[PDB]
From Swiss-Prot:
PTM sites of type N-acetylmethionine: M1
Binding locations of Ca(2+) 1: D65, T68, E73
Domain of life: Eukaryota
Protein name: Troponin C, slow skeletal and cardiac muscles
Disease: Cardiomyopathy, dilated, 1Z: A disorder characterized by ventricular dilation and impaired systolic function, resulting in congestive heart failure and arrhythmia. Patients are at risk of premature death. Cardiomyopathy, familial hypertrophic, 13: A hereditary heart disorder characterized by ventricular hypertrophy, which is usually asymmetric and often involves the interventricular septum. The symptoms include dyspnea, syncope, collapse, palpitations, and chest pain. They can be readily provoked by exercise. The disorder has inter- and intrafamilial variability ranging from benign to malignant forms with high risk of cardiac failure and sudden cardiac death.
Segments forming domain EF-hand: 16-51, 52-84
Effect upon mutating L29Q: In CMH13; impairs protein kinase A dependent signaling from cardiac troponin I to troponin C
């Protein structure tokens, strides 16, 4: 696990991590694929109750990505988005 991320992910409970995994898993054929598309990224975040804007998703992809998102990248993007609630 990349150390920078390791600390973003420390904001999440084991229960949150499991929930987020369950949502993410809807959007991949896990028996052969580890990544969702950038199009699916907003869909999984919205499944989880987040509302990222289109320009935010691109900004996060630019800053977080290591057209695809794996599970740990997705966790970091969820942690970022959870901090913009009002
Ligand atoms: Ca729960
Ligand atoms: Ca649930
Ligand atoms: Ca990626």
């Amino acid at each position: 696990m990349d150390d920078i991320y390791k600390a973003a992910v420390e904001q999440l409970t084991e229960e949150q991590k499991n929930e987020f995994k369950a949502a993410f898993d809807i959007f991949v054929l896990g028996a052969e694929d580890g990544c969702i598309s950038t199009k699916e990224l907003g869909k999984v975040m919205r499944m989880l109750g987040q509302n990222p804007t289109p320009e935010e998703l691109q900004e996060m992809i630019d800053e977080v990505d290591e057209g695809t998102v794996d599970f740990d990248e997705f966790l970091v993007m969820m942690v970022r988005c959870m901090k913009d609630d009002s």
